[PDB]
Amino acid sequence: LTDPIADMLTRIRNATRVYKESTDVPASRFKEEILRILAREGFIKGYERVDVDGKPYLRVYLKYGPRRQGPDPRPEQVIHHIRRISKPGRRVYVGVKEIPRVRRGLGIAILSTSKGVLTDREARKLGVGGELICEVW
Template identity: 25%
Template sequence: MRHDPLNDIINSIKSASRTGNRTIEAEPAARLIGRVLKVMQDYNYLRSFEVVDESKGGKFKIVLSDTINNCGVIKPRFPVKNSLLEKYEARYLPAQDFGILILTTTKGVMSHIEARKQGLGGRLLAYVY
C-alpha cells in the first residue's frame, strides 16, 4: 500500500542518480507527479519523461540528466506565503540561487522562482539541487 507516491518517485530519482542509472520507470502516473516532473524538466534536472500507459495507473519513463545532486519531498507540506519563501529556501537548499523548491499554488505547480515573480504562495512539495 502506497502512502505517498510523490515520495516514492522522488526517492527513485535520487537513488538512480546516485547509482548512475539514467532511465527509470516509476508508477503511478498521477497528474500532480507529472506536473512536478515537468518543473524538474524545465530546470534541466530531467532530460525527458513520458507516460507509458500499460496498466491501471500507468507508469512514467524518466530519463535523468547529470545535474541532480540531491532531491527530496518536503513533509509536512507547509503552507507558505510569498514573503516567507526565502526562509524555506535557506532551510532546504544549500545556497542561494542553487536549486529549486517545487510548490503547488492556485496557478498550478511551479518553482519558488516563478512563484516569487508572480507574487504567489502555496504548499511546498519538494526540493531539487
C-alpha cells in the first residue's frame, strides 16, 4: 500500500458508487484532517474513530441525494468526483497565486499547507499554498 491518501479517496469512491451508508478506512491524523473538510463542506455526514479487530479505523458516513423517478431510481451522488492530484510518483505543489478553482467554484480543492489542510477558498484567504492533495465535487 503505497498511497494511503489515494486509497481512502478510492475507498469512498468505490463505496459511494454502490450506495453504502458507511465504509471504514485505516486511520491516521492526516486522513482525519482530510475527512474533517469533507464534512465541513457537506461531502460526507462525518466520521468516527472506530476500531476493527483492535486496529484504529475511520468509519466514514456517506451521503446521497433524493431518490429519483424513472428507470434509474438510484439517487444522484454528492461526491460526484474525487481524485488524487499530488502522488508519490509526482508531488504537486502550487503557490497561493496558482491555486485552481475546482468546477468554477462549485468544487473544493484540498491542500496541505504549513497552516494545515485547507480548501482552495480557505487557502486563498490565509494567503498560503501547499501540496495539492485532491479535488472534489
